[PDB]
């Protein structure tokens, strides 16, 4: 008894010994859940946050749910591999349980992230195939969306985060990966400048007009009207006056794994084409 292990160089430069073929993965960091599920990995524990997604909840039925810090619950599932963010405060505790892969979220753009998960579980060929399909499809989608909204149309992305107005770059979820990378739509220029270093930013809500483009995607679907959509400033944005607001489901759009990506691809394409009428 002794699963054969392979060396893996983590984001921090440290090498760790992980199973060549992991059988029981505890996915504490939920960014990585859908991508590992897509690759057929056996996940024995997953962060309860997946249950906020219209896409991922059904995909993890029967899988033990865990919240942040629950080392005991993770231990009980006897995992052979544990996935956490670099910002996780319980990393040493996880390490005493199973080889723990510590991912620095901002080190991987969304396609490289899925390639990274392919390396972890030894299924890079499956990633390649999926990626080629994704790119070809979203390339045609983006060309169609551009003809509908206009090649130079800018698109802003707004979200309420901890009771504050936030915006995002092209790889911090909220649909940004599909809007700005897969579709190739133009990001509103002040949004791009502000989010350029960090990938995300709080926006002073009285300055929202500064960051508002030809179209606005807001993660407010199914919610009461947020503070930032209720102002006279919001009412007088050209995008608002023109009927160019697209609303999306925040719990679902937070993610950027292959299942979520296919959903946001369809949903945004539909909403963007409608908003352009």
């Amino acid at each position: 008894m002794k699963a054969e292990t392979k060396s893996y160089k983590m984001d921090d430069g440290k090498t760790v010994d992980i199973p060549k073929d992991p059988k029981r993965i505890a996915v504490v960091a939920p960014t990585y859940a859908g991508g590992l599920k897509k690759l057929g990995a056996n996940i024995v524990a997953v962060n309860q946050q997946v249950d906020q997604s219209k896409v991922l909840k059904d995909k993890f039925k029967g899988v033990t749910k865990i919240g942040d810090g629950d080392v005991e619950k993770v231990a009980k599932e006897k995992p052979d591999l544990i996935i956490v963010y670099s910002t996780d405060k319980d990393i040493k505790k996880y390490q005493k349980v199973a080889p723990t892969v510590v991912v620095d979220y901002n080190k991987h753009k969304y396609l490289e992230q899925q390639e990274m998960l392919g390396k972890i579980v030894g299924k890079e060929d499956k990633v390649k195939a999926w990626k080629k399909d994704w790119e070809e499809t979203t390339a045609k989608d983006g060309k169609e969306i551009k003809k509908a909204i206009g090649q130079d149309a800018t698109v802003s992305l707004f979200d309420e985060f901890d009771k504050k107005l936030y915006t995002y770059g092209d790889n911090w979820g909220r649909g940004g990966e599909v809007l700005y990378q897969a579709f190739g739509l133009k990001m509103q220029p002040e949004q791009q400048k502000l989010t350029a270093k960090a990938g995300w930013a709080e926006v002073k809500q009285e300055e929202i007009e500064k960051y508002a483009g030809d179209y606005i995607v807001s993660t407010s679907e199914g919610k009461p009207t947020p503070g930032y959509e209720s102002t006279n400033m919001w009412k007088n944005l050209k995008a608002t006056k023109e009927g160019h607001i697209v609303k999306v489901d925040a719990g679902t759009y937070w993610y950027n794994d292959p299942y979520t990506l296919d959903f946001m691809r369809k949903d945004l394409k539909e909403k963007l084409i409608k908003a352009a009428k």
Binding site: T31, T87, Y105, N106, G199
Partner: peptide
Amino acid sequence: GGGAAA
């Protein structure tokens, strides 16, 4: 990331 979860 710093100042938030990731």
